[PDB]
Amino acid sequence: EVVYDKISKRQRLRVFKHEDGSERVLSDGDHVEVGQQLMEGSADPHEV
Numbered sequence: 737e738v739v740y741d742k743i744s745k746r747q748r749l750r751v752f753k754h755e756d757g758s759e760r761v762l763s764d765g766d767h768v769e770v771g772q773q774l775m776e777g778s779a780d781p782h783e784v
Contacts, residue, residue: 748776
């Protein structure tokens with residue numbers, strides 16, 4: 737299991753939706769695909 741260790745609450749949480757779980761902000765327990773962005777902001781393109 738992958739660990740994203742620390743994110744300051746200055747960062748908002750991502751507002752996507754998929755798999756018709758929620759349709760709103762990243763919900764605890766929600767299902768996440770491979771390329772899904774977890775946070776509002778700009779993603780490192782090396783990572784993608």
